[PDB]
Amino acid sequence: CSVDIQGNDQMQFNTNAITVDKSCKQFTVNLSHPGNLPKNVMGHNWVLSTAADMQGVVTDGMASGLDKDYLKPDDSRVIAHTKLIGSGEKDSVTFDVSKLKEGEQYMFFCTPHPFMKGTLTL
Ligand SMILES: [Cu+2]
């Protein structure tokens, strides 16, 4: 009921599609950042939202700034998210699988690098 994801210096996630077993009651995303670049230069976060809510989350996120992990505080559109991390760091996030609906389209992405994205499916 977990998945390990890496966001590197070349602005790439090592997965573009996540599968969550609806049998799981909790899902865990373990984000790590291989490379040398610091959080202020190559910071990555892992954010989950519906495909439709993605742009809103990304724009309002960038405006919130680095100190707010490029995420709008208490954003109800963010189903789950990790903290912004720099190279060498690591951060995990666990969420209730019931926050997800079967058949709906979810996108996971990094707000400061929204092209680093993928799908999340139950
Ligand atoms: Cu990023």
Side-chain angles (χ1 to χ4, degrees), residues 45 47 57 60-61 64-65 68-73 78 81-82 111:
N45 59 19
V47 190
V57 170
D60 294 328
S64 300
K68 293 187 184 306
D69 294 313
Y70 289 123
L71 286 173
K72 173 184 170 187
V78 172
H81 73 76
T82 61
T111 49

Side-chain angles (χ1 to χ4, degrees), residues 7-8 11-13 33 41-46 84-85 109-116:
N8 62 24
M11 302 172 274
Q12 316 170 302
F13 270 141
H33 185 322
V41 174
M42 188 58 70
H44 299 307
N45 59 19
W46 183 85
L84 185 70
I85 64 173
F109 44 93
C110 172
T111 49
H113 302 121
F115 50 86
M116 289 178 72

Side-chain angles (χ1 to χ4, degrees), residues 82-103:
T82 61
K83 305 171 186 180
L84 185 70
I85 64 173
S87 68
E89 291 187 63
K90 57 191 298 178
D91 189 58
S92 303
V93 61
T94 302
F95 58 88
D96 195 319
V97 175
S98 295
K99 295 285 195 57
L100 301 178
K101 219 170 192 179
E102 311 168 72

